[PDB]
């Protein structure tokens, strides 16, 4: 019932303990693994937690909302298919076109988020190779980042100051780093131990471990 957080914590401890930036010659590129490229990440997000919840877009162009009442609504990339998740985790599927009165408000909110993201926000990982839809399990913000935990076990950390991002997957035991210049690279964590990485990635992985600890401490 961990949603893979304990596995992620173990993987991060291992990489960080190896002190990957403290090497004579860092060979980060050797840690790149095409087999580990994530299928899903959060491309856009809108924090409306003061009243409604957290709206987001996944890289497949689906949109989701985690509402303040702990229910979730997901619109698939076809623009009509909906998945609704009740508080107890019970899922059901419906359509926008034939939606009931009970979901009128939540659909209206999802549409607001979708339109806002389309008109006013840039896609994280825009020019990336296209080659079960996860939802937002939980999230929080620190002074430096927003932490997004997806139902597939992935943890995404978006750093506010420089727009760098980590997408951590405990299934692949991998990290994808999106740098300030928007370069998108996927590494196997065990290979970062072996080959090393730059100080910038190493520092963000140290922060990531603290964030996973936070997720584990606030279940």
From Swiss-Prot:
Region described as Important for interaction with phosphorylated proteins: spans on this chain: 163-165
Effect listed in the UniProt record for changing residue 46 to A: Loss of centrosomal localization and of S-phase progression
UniProt modification remark: Ubiquitinated by the anaphase promoting complex/cyclosome (APC/C) in anaphase and following DNA damage, leading to its degradation by the proteasome. Ubiquitination is mediated via its interaction with FZR1/CDH1. Ubiquitination and subsequent degradation prevents entry into mitosis and is essential to maintain an efficient G2 DNA damage checkpoint.
Residues recorded with modification Phosphothreonine: 129
POLO box domain boundaries: 41-119, 135-217
Consequence when changing residue 165 to M: In pincer mutant; loss of centrosomal location and decreased interaction with phosphorylated CDC25C and BUB1
Induction, per UniProt: By growth-stimulating agents.
Quaternary structure (record): Interacts with CEP170. Interacts with EVI5. Interacts with FAM29A. Interacts with SLX4/BTBD12. Interacts with TTDN1. Interacts (via POLO-box domain) with the phosphorylated form of BUB1, CDC25C and CENPU. Interacts with KIF2A. Interacts with CYLD. Part of an astrin (SPAG5)-kinastrin (SKAP) complex containing KNSTRN, SPAG5, PLK1, DYNLL1 and SGO2. Interacts with BIRC6/bruce. Interacts with CDK1-phosphorylated FRY; this interaction occurs in mitotic cells, but not in interphase cells. FRY interaction facilitates AURKA-mediated PLK1 phosphorylation.
Protein name per its UniProtKB record: Serine/threonine-protein kinase PLK1
Boundaries of the shown chain within the full protein: 371 to 594 of 603
């Amino acid at each position: 019932f961990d949603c893979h957080l304990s596995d992620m914590l173990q993987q991060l401890h291992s990489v960080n303990a190896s002190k990957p930036s403290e090497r004579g010659l860092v060979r980060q590129e050797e840690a790149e693994d095409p087999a580990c490229i994530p299928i899903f990440w959060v491309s856009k997000w809108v924090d409306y937690s003061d009243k409604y919840g957290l709206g987001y877009q996944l890289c497949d162009n689906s949109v989701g909302v985690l509402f303040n009442d702990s229910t979730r609504l997901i619109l698939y990339n076809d623009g009509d298919s909906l998945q609704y998740i009740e508080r107890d985790g019970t899922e059901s599927y419906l359509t926008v076109s034939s939606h009931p009165n009970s979901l009128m408000k939540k659909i209206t909110l999802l549409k607001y988020f979708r339109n806002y993201m389309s008109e006013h926000l840039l896609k994280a990982g825009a020019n990336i190779t296209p080659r079960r839809l996860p939802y937002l399990r939980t999230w929080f913000r620190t002074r430096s980042a927003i932490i997004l935990h997806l139902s597939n076990g992935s943890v995404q950390i978006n750093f506010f100051q420089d727009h760098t991002k980590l997408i951590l997957c405990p299934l692949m035991a991998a990290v994808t780093y999106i740098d300030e210049k928007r370069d998108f690279r996927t590494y196997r964590l065990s290979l970062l131990e072996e080959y090393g990485c730059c100080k910038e990635l190493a520092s963000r992985l140290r922060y990531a471990r603290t964030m996973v600890d936070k997720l584990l401490s606030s279940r």
